[PDB]
Design a protein around this ligand. Structure first.
Ligand SMILES: O=C(O)[C@]1(O)C[C@H](O)[C@@H](O)[C@H]([C@H](O)[C@H](O)CO)O1
Length: 309
């Protein structure tokens, strides 16, 4: 309570994100000897992630989550993190952010231009596609009214596989699916579980199309005001929570398919070759729009070996 701080997020109280944010909050309170208390504001109470990023910049929110890909809003080449099928796995996502010149520069700009400090990175699952009718092949996407978040890379995913995208906020999705205003949505399995989308979607297709990370972000206005020993408490707690965050996602990912089958969901495994083929002209458009910066980021990312060594 010397520092009453706030951590906003789109995820809800049943989510892995929230569980790991609770761990972070508990560690910070303990190790700051009570000087800092972090309260959680889930379910987009404060707005969406675009809004919460603005609040961190302004200093009116202290902590939030965002993907590396979400920074495409300021630096177009950062969409590389969510070009479908480009990032192979989380090992690549980690090296793309921390071990490339592109990623290192992005982190610096976040701090210097956007007033946000990157404390840690976790894995947030690989997106799959749920729907009210089977997706047995890419043909089934044609005219599927597929909800997407308000993000260019997801809108593109939907466009290029032949679906009819409808952007809407995460908070509005469950109702849209339940009323069949849309036919499907796409998110990692842990979100399908957390938001109970499986109650209102009969089918799950393993499209494996976009890999999400999650960054623990702090407003510079807040971080700069903490004495350095408290900065260290926050940084160390964010790193500890991110490892736990990743583990919740990794441990659950395979098992969740069983969980959904038991809830009555039918699982399909469409041939992904035509999905990946369909993205070829999108990668071309990305390079055309983002220029040499985008080409360079793609090359640095494609150079990363996806196997742990
Ligand atoms: O609305 C969604 O389905 C969601 O997955 C919810 C999740 O909490 C959020 O981090 C992401 C993110 O906003 C997009 O992937 C664009 O970066 O969107």
């Amino acid at each position: 309570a010397d520092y009453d701080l706030k951590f906003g997020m789109n995820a809800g109280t049943s989510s892995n994100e929230y569980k790991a944010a609770e761990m972070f909050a508990k560690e910070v309170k303990e190790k700051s000897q009570g000087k800092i208390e972090i309260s959680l504001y889930p379910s987009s109470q404060l707005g969406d992630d675009r809004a919460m990023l603005k609040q961190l910049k302004d200093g009116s929110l202290d902590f939030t989550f965002a993907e590396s890909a979400r920074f495409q809003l300021f630096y177009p080449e950062a969409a590389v993190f969510a070009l479908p099928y480009v990032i192979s796995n989380y090992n690549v996502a980690q090296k793309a952010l921390f071990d490339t010149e592109f990623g290192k520069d992005l982190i610096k700009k976040m701090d210097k231009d956007l007033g946000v400090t990157l404390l840690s990175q976790a894995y947030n699952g690989t997106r799959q596609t749920t729907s009210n009718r089977a997706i047995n092949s890419i043909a089934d996407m044609k005219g599927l009214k597929l909800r997407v978040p308000n993000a260019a890379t997801n809108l593109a995913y939907a466009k290029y596989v032949g679906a009819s995208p409808t952007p809407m906020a995460f908070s509005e999705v469950y109702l849209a699916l339940q009323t069949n205003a849309v036919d499907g949505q796409e998110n990692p399995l842990a979100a399908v579980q957390a938001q109970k989308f499986y109650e209102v979607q009969k089918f799950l297709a393993m499209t494996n199309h976009i890999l999400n990370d999650q960054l623990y972000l702090v407003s510079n206005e807040t971080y700069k005001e903490l004495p350095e020993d408290l900065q260290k408490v926050v940084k160390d707690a964010a790193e500890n929570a991110a490892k736990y965050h990743t583990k919740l996602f990794v441990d659950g990912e395979k098992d969740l398919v069983t969980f959904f089958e038991k809830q009555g969901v039918k699982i399909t495994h469409p041939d992904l070759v035509p999905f990946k083929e369909s993205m070829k002209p999108y990668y071309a458009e990305f390079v055309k729009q983002t220029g040499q910066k985008g080409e360079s980021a793609l090359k640095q990312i494609e150079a990363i070996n996806p196997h742990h060594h």
